């Protein structure tokens, strides 16, 4: 058995490197949101709440992980806090990820009432409530659901611990059924599955709106061909009524107002000539619609299509962050399941344990890179902060 401090030094040095990277990167995120008013929206307030949790990982959680890896002697309830505080930060991350996904669903499904519904003052209260719940969930072992009542006395006497103290080790103070049933399944697995369903609805809503824009565009062009090769006033009237309804739908479904006023007015002109039985005069009046379509309607169709694709792009960025969190945290939770569900399986090796813990801490580093690589406003702001 090699001296423990040797393998400890590699684990401690890697953890300190992660803390430095987590603090710097996420301080840059908060500094960007504080300075740039274009980044000051409800969605980024949860981002700052998410960066706040990751900053606290480097300042407190990682030093707590280094401390509890030594097995030092401590009072059990004080040991519980050092062991469980990272669960509070992880829970706060879950609430901030679920909130971003919900905020993005509201923006894309009901954009007409998003500004009146999702305000800044309400977002601050949600962040405050989600942090209080995160403490309640993460520090639940301190409310009684712990192993403090049954200490490993032989392990404490071998390490010179005093009376009322224990060897502070995670598995000895935090019960595994809490970590598996309460923390992982209920408070981590279920919310992540909810986020997956929310993002499925977002992308499904985005795809449905883009076929609607294209379907009203084809309906506009197809009925124009029908009018040109019609042979009676009733066929011209049938296509004009379906265009007037389709034009109106675009106006509701959202210079813009003037272009549709011309389009509906020109359809009414040809509709009146069709009801009077003047077929040739209605076809010529319907030909004027192509001028309005080229100068107004097509230009609006590429802006509406451009805005939706930007909402899809922002939605994938958010989804990536959520997926990364799961990727970074699943290994640790899966190891807990093997130990809890299979007591006959051999223990997970010590090196693999600290690899999974280090992987879970690395999630506090990755977010600021995603913003830089996927969001122009954050990346531009990062450069300004750095250069200056
Ligand atoms: C505002 C921030 C920086 C304050 C940080 C407070 C932290 C560092 C404090 C608060 C509670 C403290 C713990 C409370 C009780 C005990 C029991 C004792 O037998 C060993 C130390 C131990 C385990 C303490 C370690 C340090 C501790 C975790
Ligand atoms: C997000 C997705 C991956 C869902 C998470 C699935 C988790 C809960 C699954 C995936 C693999 C599963 C483990 C696979 C194998 C074993 C060994 C067996 O002797 C007891 C159950 C146990 C320990 C399973 C427990 C639950 C488990 C960890
Ligand atoms: C979410 C993605 C990255 C999947 C992660 C897969 C990881 C977490 C899986 C793959 C193989 C797994 C190991 C396979 C076999 C054993 C031996 C058993 O005696 C204890 C658990 C242990 C040591 C498992 C721990 C978890 C493990 C390392
Ligand atoms: C990012 C921190 C997440 C919270 N967390 C855990 O979830 C966690 N599970 C475990 C194990 C090891 C052994 C086999 C399985 C059951 C128990 C006992 C795994 N040890 C953990 N530790 C600390 C470890 C020593 O430093 C821990 O901090
Ligand atoms: C132990 C520590 C636990 C709490 C730590 C950090 C929370 C603070 C960070 C949350 C950032 C919220 C963004 C914000 O406040 O913006 C709202 C603005 O006021 C709209 O009016
Ligand atoms: C304990 C420390 C935690 C770090 C939390 C840092 C969060 C403070 C950053 C302030 C910020 O980002 O402001 C948001 C913006 O001002 C809204 O309008
Ligand atoms: C902000 C940075 C905080 C850093 C580390 C957390 C504090 C670590 C706790 C140190 C406890 C040392 C201790 O308890 O010493 C054992 C003594 O022998 C008891 O009998
Ligand atoms: C979806 C995740 C739920 C997965 C549930 C995994 C349960 C595995 C289990 O219960 O098997 C252990 C058995 O008791 C051996 O003692
Ligand atoms: C999506 C959410 C996933 C929920 C799964 C619940 C399944 C619970 C597992 C049922 C097994 C109960 C059991 O046998 O307990 C294992 C035993 O305690 C070993 O120590
Ligand atoms: C919405 C949930 C409310 C937020 C969670 C806060 C719960 C309020 C009550 C807290 C009491 C906790 C006191 C724990 C001390 C335990 C002492 C001991 O067991 O030895
Ligand atoms: C871990 C135990 C979980 C604790 C559950 C307790 C339930 C607390 C839930 C609170 C959410 C409601 C917030 C109400 C704030 C006021 C809102 C308002 O004034 O408009
Ligand atoms: C930086 C140094 C942090 C010290 C952690 C404990 C060292 C040890 O393993 O004995
Ligand atoms: C980032 C990639 C680097 C991964 C290295 C991290 C951990 C493996 C180090 C093995 C040391 C075992 C720890 C022993 C102990 O803590 O007592
Ligand atoms: C450590 C936490 C990092 C937080 C840094 C980001 C925002 C905090 C508020 C900034 C206060 C300085 C304002 C100066 C100015 O407006 O020019
Ligand atoms: C900006 C915030 C600064 C806080 C970080 C300070 C550095 C923390 C580094 C290591 C913590 C480990 C100290 C105690 C380890 C256990 C040793 C023991 O008591 O037996
Ligand atoms: C602000 C930073 C202050 C805290 C920094 C390091 C905590 C050191 C932990 C104390 C180790 C105990 C030494 C001993 O047992 O003699
Ligand atoms: C603020 C955190 C202070 C409360 C922690 C007290 C630990 C309980 C104990 O010493 O047994
Ligand atoms: C413990 C409760 C901490 C509440 C802190 C949340 C910050 C509220 C805010 O500024 O929006
Ligand atoms: C659940 C735990 C409750 C904690 C008290 C926090 C209430 C904050 C009020 C803000 C509500 C809001 O503006 O939407
Ligand atoms: C224990 C209470 C700790 C933190 C909750 C503080 C409430 C903060 C105000 C709510 C946010 C807001 O409405 O602006
Ligand atoms: C702010 C959010 C409030 C959430 C409350 C959750 C846990 C409180 C834990 C206090 C436990 C103190 C240790 C008891 C002791 O001294 O023995
Ligand atoms: C649990 C593992 C599932 C996903 C993690 C993969 C990493 C990125 C996934 C999100 C990308 C996307 O949905 O566009
Ligand atoms: C547990 C696995 C789920 C993790 C949450 C990840 C959210 C990303 C899903 C994006 C949906 C998609 O584009 O296919
Ligand atoms: C590189 C990251 C590690 C890759 C795969 C995990 C496989 C570790 C499983 C080894 C079995 C340990 C044992 O003997 O119990
Ligand atoms: C370990 C995490 C693995 C992959 C995520 C890397 C983030 C950088 C991409 C921008
Ligand atoms: Na996080």
Q: Count the helices and strands in the chain (H runs, E runs).
A: 19, 2
First to last CA, the chain: 52
Looking at the CA of residue 16, tell me the nearest atom of ligand 12: 1
Q: Residues with Cβ within 5 Å of ion ligand 26?
A: 53-54, 93
Pairing of the two strands 165-167 and 73-75: antiparallel
Looking at the CA of residue 357, tell me the nearest atom of ligand 4: 1
For residue 303, count other CB atoms closer than 10 A to its CB: 10
**Resolution expressed in Å:** 2.8
Shortest CA distance to 270 belongs to which of 304, 227, 222? Answer: 227
φ, ψ dihedrals at 74, nearest 5°: -160, 160
Contacts of residue 131, defined as CB under 8 A and 6 or more positions apart, other chains included, come to: 49, 92, 95
Residue among 60, 64, 72, 78 to mutate when testing ligand 17 (max atoms within 8 A of CB): 78
CB 212 within 8 A of CB 262: no
Enter the tokens of residue 41.
């929206």
Q: How far is CA 342 from CA 24, 169, 352, in A?
A: 40, 21, 17
16 C-alpha to ligand 16 centroid (Å)? 16
Say yes or no: CB of residue 123 within 6 Å of ligand 6.
no
381 C-alpha to ligand 4 centroid (Å)? 38
Say yes or no: CB of residue 273 within 6 Å of ligand 6.
no
CB 146 within 8 A of CB 177: no
HSE toward the beta carbon, residue 144, CA cutoff 13 A: 0
Technique behind the model: X-ray
Residue among 12, 56, 63 to mutate when testing ligand 15 (max atoms within 8 A of CB): 63
């Amino acid at each position: 058995g090699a001296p423990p401090i040797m393998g400890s030094s590699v684990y401690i040095t890697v953890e300190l490197a992660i803390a430095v990277l987590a603090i710097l990167g996420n301080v840059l995120v908060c500094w960007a949101v504080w300075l740039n008013s274009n980044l000051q929206n409800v969605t980024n307030y949860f981002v700052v709440s998410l960066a706040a949790a990751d900053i606290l990982v480097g300042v407190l959680a990682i030093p707590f992980a280094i401390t509890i890896s030594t097995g030092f002697c401590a009072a059990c309830h004080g040991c519980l806090f050092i062991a469980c505080f990272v669960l509070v930060l992880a829970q706060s991350s879950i609430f901030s990820l679920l909130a971003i996904a919900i905020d993005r669903y509201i923006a894309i499904a009901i954009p007409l009432r998003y500004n009146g519904l999702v305000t800044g003052t309400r977002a601050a209260g949600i962040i405050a409530i989600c942090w209080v719940l995160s403490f309640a969930i993460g520090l639940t072992p301190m409310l009684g659901w712990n192993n403090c009542g049954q200490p490993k006395e032989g392990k404490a006497h071998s390490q010179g611990c005093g009376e009322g103290q224990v060897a502070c080790l995670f598995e000895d103070v935090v019960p595994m059924n809490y970590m598996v049933y309460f923390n992982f399944f209920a408070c981590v697995l279920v919310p992540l599955l909810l986020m997956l369903g929310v993002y499925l609805r977002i992308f499904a809503a985005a795809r449905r709106q883009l076929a609607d824009l294209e379907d009203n565009w084809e309906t506009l062009n197809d009925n124009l061909k029908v009018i040109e090769k019609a042979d009676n006033a009733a066929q011209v009237k049938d296509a004009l009524t379906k265009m007037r309804a389709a034009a109106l739908d675009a106006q509701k479904a959202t210079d813009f107002r003037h272009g549709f006023d011309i389009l509906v007015g020109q359809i009414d002109d040809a509709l009146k000539l069709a009801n009077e039985g003047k077929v040739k005069e209605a076809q010529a009046a319907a030909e004027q619609l192509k001028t309005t379509r080229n100068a107004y309607i097509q230009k609006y169709l590429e802006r509406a299509r451009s805005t939706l694709q930007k909402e899809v792009h922002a939605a994938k960025s958010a989804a990536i962050i959520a997926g990364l969190f799961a990727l970074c945290w699943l290994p640790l939770h899966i190891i807990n399941c093997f130990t809890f569900f299979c007591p006959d399986c051999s223990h997970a090796p010590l090196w693999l344990m600290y690899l999974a813990i280090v992987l879970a801490h690395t999630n506090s580093v990755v977010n600021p890179f995603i913003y830089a690589y996927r969001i122009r406003e954050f990346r531009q702001t990062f450069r300004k902060i750095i250069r200056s």
